[PDB]
């Protein structure tokens, strides 16, 4: 369920403390469950209106690039073909998210053997956008692991205070 | 929906594209292991492992009591195959025969999909130098990770339905 508070206090700290090598980003680690798909743990730095409005309506269920990614494991832009594609269909997420400027992006993605689904959702906010997308891209492999070792460690840590 | 990994031409053809990429971490064996975890018998290998191993361990299920194959199973990171995670499971009967091959130190990738597939991405220095082969793991490993997680995605496309 993912629900401590102090756990996820940690993480996020571990996520902020390496992320912000690759720029000054915008991110959201969001991870859901299908034995808990009303209450996905968000670990972020968007803007807190816009997630608390994001969990409040439960948008990850028509988002696109959490559509994407459940059928991805490697990493993609937001507007690849299979977003744009998803976004025709329901425009609704990304039509609010412009407000904070959330616009272009990269989705990392991540399954578990736990039925866990971990994607690392990363923007450059307003910034220029060229030389963010190929920072991101140079740095792909890098922050593929990122998202990797992040999982692994909020796993540990919840397997430690289960033990606890 | 993803179909069986079983057609011989693209299975060759996805052989060489990742013999091609590997070969720049090193001269190395590799295998790349899919196996379903919800019917996980007949797992699919695509590797340059020497034959007469692969082939034992396909006749005799090996993959369900291999130490790294076990470990694989519950990890999202890739891990050495002297962690401690692996010693604990080390029947040691895999890495006994192994041996016989100079099988001996190694690495496992490990990629979870959403088809209920776990694949692995499995190296070994062979009788080739070790610490050269551990210092080139230890640098390289988020790029050996994108190459499990790219070969892996192109299977599948490749079987997709
Ligand atoms: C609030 C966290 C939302 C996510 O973690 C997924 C995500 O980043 N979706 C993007 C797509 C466009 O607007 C978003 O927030
Ligand atoms: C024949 C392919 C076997 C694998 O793909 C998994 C693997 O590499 N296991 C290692 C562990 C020690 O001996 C092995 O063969």
């Given at each position: 369920?993912?629900?401590?508070?102090?756990?996820?206090?940690?993480?996020?700290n571990?996520?902020?403390?390496?992320?912000?090598?690759?720029g000054?980003?915008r991110?959201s680690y969001?991870?859901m469950?299908?034995?808990?798909?009303?209450?996905?743990?968000?670990?972020?730095?968007?803007?807190?209106?816009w997630?608390?409005?994001?969990?409040?309506?439960?948008?990850?269920?028509?988002?696109?690039?959490?559509l994407?990614?459940?059928?991805?494991?490697?990493p993609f832009?937001?507007?690849?073909?299979?977003?744009?594609?998803?976004k025709?269909?329901?425009?609704?997420?990304?039509?609010?998210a412009?407000?904070?400027?959330?616009?272009?992006?990269?989705?990392?993605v991540?399954h578990?053997?736990?039925?866990?689904?971990?994607?690392?959702?990363?923007?450059?906010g307003?910034?220029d956008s060229?030389?963010?997308?190929?920072?991101?891209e140079?740095?792909?492999?890098?922050?593929?692991?990122?998202?990797?070792?992040?999982?692994?460690?909020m796993?540990?840590?919840?397997?430690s205070?289960?033990?606890?």
């Open positions: 369920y993912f629900d401590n508070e102090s756990i996820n206090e940690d993480i996020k571990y996520i902020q403390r390496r992320i912000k090598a690759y000054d980003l991110y969001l991870v469950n299908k034995k808990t798909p009303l209450h996905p743990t968000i670990i972020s730095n968007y803007p807190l209106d997630v608390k409005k994001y969990k409040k309506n439960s948008y990850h269920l028509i988002d696109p690039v959490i994407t990614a459940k059928d991805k494991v490697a832009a937001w507007d690849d073909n299979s977003v744009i594609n998803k025709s269909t329901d425009s609704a997420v990304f039509k609010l412009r407000e904070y400027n959330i616009v272009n992006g990269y989705t990392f991540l578990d053997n736990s039925n866990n689904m971990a994607t690392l959702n990363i923007s450059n307003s910034d060229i030389s963010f997308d190929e920072s991101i140079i740095n792909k492999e890098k922050i593929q692991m990122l998202l990797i070792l992040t999982h692994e460690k796993l540990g840590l919840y397997q205070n289960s033990d606890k």
